[PDB]
Ligand binder design. Structure first.
Ligand SMILES: Cc1cc2nc3c(=O)[nH]c(=O)nc-3n(C[C@H](O)[C@H](O)[C@H](O)COP(=O)(O)OP(=O)(O)OC[C@H]3O[C@@H](n4cnc5c(N)ncnc54)[C@H](O)[C@@H]3O)c2cc1C
Ligand SMILES: NC(=O)C1=CN([C@@H]2O[C@H](COP(=O)(O)OP(=O)(O)OC[C@H]3O[C@@H](n4cnc5c(N)ncnc54)[C@H](OP(=O)(O)O)[C@@H]3O)[C@@H](O)[C@H]2O)C=CC1
Ligand code: HEM
Ligand code: HEM
Length: 399
């Protein structure tokens, strides 16, 4: 659920829609609905550009891509009613046929984007990048149809041109420029350690210091023979200055390649730190809940804060003793810090993590990381006991 932490972004979108509606209604009322869809198409491209101001307005990157999907579905709904009320399956002029091609690509990509869970991510991304061709085709359709009406000195020309230019510049940056210029942190892998049968820890030495807060993540691009160079998001699992740690559990084809084939010395590139789950920014009393490899944001805090200044209760859940990581680190940290409580929950042995009879501290923030299904159940039970509790959760999926 959205809140005031994402109200700057929401007010920007409603300002974009209200201003577009007023500009069209006062100039060309017959084109309010196609005009509104072009603004939504512009905002969808902006919301996919991955800019620091984007997540500063929409709180988290998960909420950025949720709105990115909402403006995508609003666009196709308005374009379908544009096509239904203004034309047919195929157009008679070249200008109309450009809008026919664009709507076919827009509907085909949106259909594939939604029910494309089983496709490979890079194949999905390449298919997804066809909206730029449809977006360009739509811009030809608009400017061939409304010739000399959006190329004068008036409000409508400035409004249509600016949003069309912003979407054109946003689509070019993320598709052709983001992975080439927005990855300024060049580094190489120094040491690699296998924690358990399916998790590997990567130590990276960067040529320049990396600034991040515990609980934040980055995007990793590995440059090795036999490795894909696409960016994968990983939580920073420790390190300071020119040293970064990443803890990767085999989840698919790339993460199994990291476990088995990754070698020390391979070049890596980082873009910047993302994330709203800043542990240091929480209350004095904190509750940490981690599931499986969701412990990685909490390992950065433990490594970087040898003395704990907060009242932290840690609830770690793992699939038996064979799927637990950093067990000696957590035991050593609890011994050094009296104000740190460790609660190891073997799912097979102990059972389920339940907060019904458990008591949360008064005026405490709950940081939750792990499976989405397990987090939702846990978040519900905490709110019944103390509705004033502040709950912060980070997921591992954008789609
Ligand atoms: C904010 C965040 C933090 C994360 N932190 C960690 C971490 O500390 N440790 C860890 O092991 N994993 C972490 N992940 C998950 C990690 O990004 C994926 O598990 C990994 O990219 C899967 O690689 P694969 O291609 O082998 O998996 P696949 O089998 O190809 O993918 C399966 C799942 O991974 C997703 N996925 C695949 N490729 C990408 C990609 N390039 N970008 C985004 N999602 C992708 C798919 O949507 C699907 O849900 C994090 C994810 C997010 C969003
Ligand atoms: N910041 C981020 O976004 C980060 C994302 N991640 C993601 O975190 C995820 C964690 O998954 P993984 O490492 O495989 O861990 P698992 O899902 O395998 O284990 C997590 C634990 O949750 C328990 N659990 C599941 N459902 C419930 C429930 N309803 N109530 C209580 N306990 C429950 C399981 O016990 P049981 O066997 O009884 O179900 C299990 O021990 C990964 O998908 C990873 O990609 C990783 C790092 C950080
Ligand atoms: C008019 C509709 C849409 C447009 C114009 C659009 C545009 C884009 C673009 C250009 C990208 C970046 C591609 C790249 O990095 O190469 C992107 C990313 C993304 N889009 Fe869309 N999209 C649309 C619809 C959708 C829909 C329907 C979904 C449904 C899930 C979706 C989910 C995503 C996600 C999750 C990403 C993140 C990609 C990543 O993690 O690498 N988009 N979008
Ligand atoms: C400000 C935005 C827009 C304006 C002013 C506009 C204007 C028009 C006009 C006048 C027509 C009538 C076609 C004809 O001359 O016979 C038309 C048709 C159409 N437009 Fe647009 N349009 C806009 C946006 C879009 C966009 C962005 C798309 C597609 C992505 C689109 C898709 C279509 C389709 C499919 C038709 C039907 C073509 C046909 O059957 O002949 N429109 N538009």
């Amino acid at each position: 659920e959205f809140s005031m932490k994402s109200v700057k972004g929401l007010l920007f979108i409603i300002a974009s829609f209200i201003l577009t509606l007023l500009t069209w209604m006062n100039t060309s009322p017959q084109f309010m609905i196609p005009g509104l869809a072009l603004t939504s198409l512009s905002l969808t491209f902006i919301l996919a550009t991955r800019l620091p101001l984007l997540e500063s307005w929409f709180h988290s990157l998960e909420k950025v891509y949720t709105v990115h999907k909402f403006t995508a579905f609003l666009s196709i709904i308005l374009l379908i009613f544009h096509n239904f009320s203004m034309g047919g399956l195929w157009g008679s002029r070249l200008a109309a046929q450009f809008g026919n091609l664009a709507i076919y690509i827009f509907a085909s990509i949106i259909l594939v984007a939604y029910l494309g869970k089983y496709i490979q991510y890079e194949a999905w991304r390449w298919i997804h990048r066809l909206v730029y061709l449809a977006y360009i085709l739509g811009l030809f359709h608009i400017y061939m149809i409304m010739g000399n009406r959006l190329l004068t000195f008036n409000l409508l020309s400035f409004l249509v041109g600016s949003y069309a230019l912003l979407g054109l510049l946003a689509g070019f940056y993320i598709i052709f420029l983001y992975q080439k210029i927005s990855f300024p942190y060049l580094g190489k892998i120094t040491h690699l350690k296998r924690l358990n049968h399916d998790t590997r820890e990567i130590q990276i030495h960067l040529s320049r210091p990396f600034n991040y807060q515990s609980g934040q993540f980055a995007f990793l691009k590995i440059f090795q023979e036999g490795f894909e160079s696409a960016p994968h998001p990983f939580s920073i699992s420790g390190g300071h200055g020119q040293t970064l740690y990443f803890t990767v559990k085999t989840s698919g084809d790339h993460t199994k390649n990291i476990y088995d084939n990754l070698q020390a010395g391979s070049k890596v590139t980082l873009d910047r730190a993302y994330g709203h789950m800043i542990i240091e920014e929480g209350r004095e009393n904190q509750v940490w809940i981690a599931g499986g490899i969701g412990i990685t944001p909490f390992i950065s805090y433990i490594r970087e804060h040898p003395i704990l200044d907060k009242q932290v209760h840690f609830y770690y859940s793992f699939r038996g003793d064979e799927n637990a990581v950093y067990l000696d680190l957590l035991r050593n940290y609890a011994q050094k810090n009296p104000n740190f409580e460790l609660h190891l929950i073997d799912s097979t042995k102990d059972g389920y993590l339940n907060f019904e009879q458990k008591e949360v501290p008064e005026h405490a923030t709950v940081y939750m990381c792990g499976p989405i299904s397990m987090m939702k159940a846990l978040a519900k039970q905490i709110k019944k006991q103390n509705p004033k509790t502040e709950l912060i959760y980070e997921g591992a999926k954008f789609k």
